[PDB]
Amino acid sequence: MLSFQYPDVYRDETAIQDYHGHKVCDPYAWLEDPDSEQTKAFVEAQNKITVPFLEQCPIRGLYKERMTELYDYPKYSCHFKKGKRYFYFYNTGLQNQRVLYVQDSLEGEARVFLDPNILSDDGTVALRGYAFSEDGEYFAYGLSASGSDWVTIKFMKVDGAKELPDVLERVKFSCMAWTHDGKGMFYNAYPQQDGKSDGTETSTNLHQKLYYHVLGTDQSEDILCAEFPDEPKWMGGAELSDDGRYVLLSIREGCDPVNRLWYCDLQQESNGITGILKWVKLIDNFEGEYDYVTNEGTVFTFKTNRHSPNYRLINIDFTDPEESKWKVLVPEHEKDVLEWVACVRSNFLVLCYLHDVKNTLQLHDLATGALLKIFPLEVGSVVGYSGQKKDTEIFYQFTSFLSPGIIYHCDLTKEELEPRVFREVTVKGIDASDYQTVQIFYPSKDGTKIPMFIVHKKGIKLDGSHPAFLYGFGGFNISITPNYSVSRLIFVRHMGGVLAVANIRGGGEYGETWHKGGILANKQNCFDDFQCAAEYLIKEGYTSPKRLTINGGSNGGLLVATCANQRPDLFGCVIAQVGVMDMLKFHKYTIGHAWTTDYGCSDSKQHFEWLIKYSPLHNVKLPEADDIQYPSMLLLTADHDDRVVPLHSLKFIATLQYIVGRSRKQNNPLLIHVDTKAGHGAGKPTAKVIEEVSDMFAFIARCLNIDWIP
Ligand SMILES: *C(=O)[C@@H]1CCCN1C(=O)[C@@H]1CCCN1C(=O)OCc1ccccc1
């Protein structure tokens, strides 16, 4: 199998740090500098062995060809109205980036409004955020290059798609909100910093501020509206109330679903937006989340988790703000999570719930909160929606494991609300009726029942002979719901595989309690839950250890890397994408400081004690038993991944190759592929997406010796 030799990698044996009395050696600390000749040489040498390994077996070509054929289907976003026009995103099939279209009426001819594809040869410049002025006549849009979180905001006049001179730099993790007078827009920007700000730097991002840009002026003239100099990690995002009277500021610190909520009655400004606004600190702590839904005068409707982990809707009257006075409009459900809420047609509320990891959609009355209509959906997820307060209709997109998705439309002006299919596309080549999706609940180590979806060809024998692909994330209140994936379906159909997704703790599937069950001191619950999912698939006969592959990205990369260290005997292959591997230093780079709410921080003695036990980089160790080696492992990262700096994967693979790779019993490959002109993943062009999945499945195919099934 292995016809390559791992590259020489210098070990700085003097790199020792004391963590509250615990000495930790970091021999590859030098890989933290992306710009050094040493790090660049390291990346080149790794890619040098990884690429030929992935490209050698013709199965990569077969997969790539089938992926290009099957992924080539029309992809539409929900239509949405702004002013007197309708807009929608659309990709004919294989365009690198989806294009934004505009039409003057639902029946009118559409025309290209904004095509990101012409901004680069390889589709590496992508739209990242946008906002139309209240009247829909002006448009602001963010552009990111090479996958970086950094954004440059540009502007256009909608009538005639005219490019305007306005350009905003140093924008990142930014809100985009126009004042209803159409004069300008609020946005966030970071102070100037030494070195690069292109996605290849590792510099921590602090002191984000809120600015107001007046259309037709230079950015140097922008008004500073809010800043938190004594709290470097605070981030304040603005949004205008539906009536345009109030600017609502949501201040966050970390990744927990909580925020301070301050407001500014624009009518009360002495002379417009001229400097720091007269903020009224309605909710001035980080004890709960308050997500604006709508307001009627001074009565504000918010979605909250304040003493309601499954979320609920409350009305806070700015004129009688005390908590004891808040009205509960839609009480918290016993088990179902209220995911999001939208106000449409003035007095209707669209509520989307997650019931056992499946979405439900319903219409409620704004005044009473009473249920009015249930919008029927098959088992799956609602991944798109449109319908603001002044709109008289809604569009929503549904997807599932076996269906590319349906876009529905409902005219809310009709006495009898009847949702209708507005757009639907089927993928020729994947007959959804040949497969079935089942949801089971398995007990974890502590007995907690964890949901898991399994997708497989109908009528298979549970004899343990099938290759399996198990996916998990487990963290940040993120719910892993059903979604359509051509790449995974090719694994099922053409590689005879079984797909599994485990809804492990740390996610938001069962509200904030589920989230808390997989963070801080309890992070190990995530790893235990996932390992138990693998054991369930094995015990029930869906697969066997040597045929099992586990995959996860970012926090999911951490998930699979830890599982490889803790239970190498349980998996045959592990693909960790853009994963956090150095749990002792993650907080030091870019936006990593925000993740301490889920993981803790090594600066704390108590936290260090939890972290050191599972940190991937610090737990690589040769399996005790002679008959056990590490599973085949592939780490995937990119040079502009400024979300999770690539040094995580670089130090981790150096460690894996040295400690485990050098052992005689280790025959399974331990590799890394670092892509160029790409980042964490958002905005990645179709061409790159195709290459990435082709790499993943070719790796699985080679390592597990799986034959292609025509
Ligand atoms: C991938 O899971 C990485 C590593 C662990 C957390 N994470 C993220 O990307 C998190 C979770 C999804 C969003 N995110 C993030 O850092 O967003 C940036 C941010 C914006 C605003 C406030 C705080 C953070």
Swiss-Prot record:
Hydrolase is among the record's keywords: yes
Top-level taxon of origin: Eukaryota
EC number: 3.4.21.26
Enzyme class: hydrolase
Species, as recorded: Sus scrofa (Pig)
Residues modified as N-acetylmethionine: 1
Modifications made to the protein after synthesis: The N-terminus is blocked.
Principal location class: cytoplasm
Key words of the record: Acetylation, Cytoplasm, Hydrolase, Protease, Serine protease
Gene coding for it: PREP
Catalytic residue list: 554 (charge relay system), 641 (charge relay system), 680 (charge relay system)
Protein name (database record): Prolyl endopeptidase
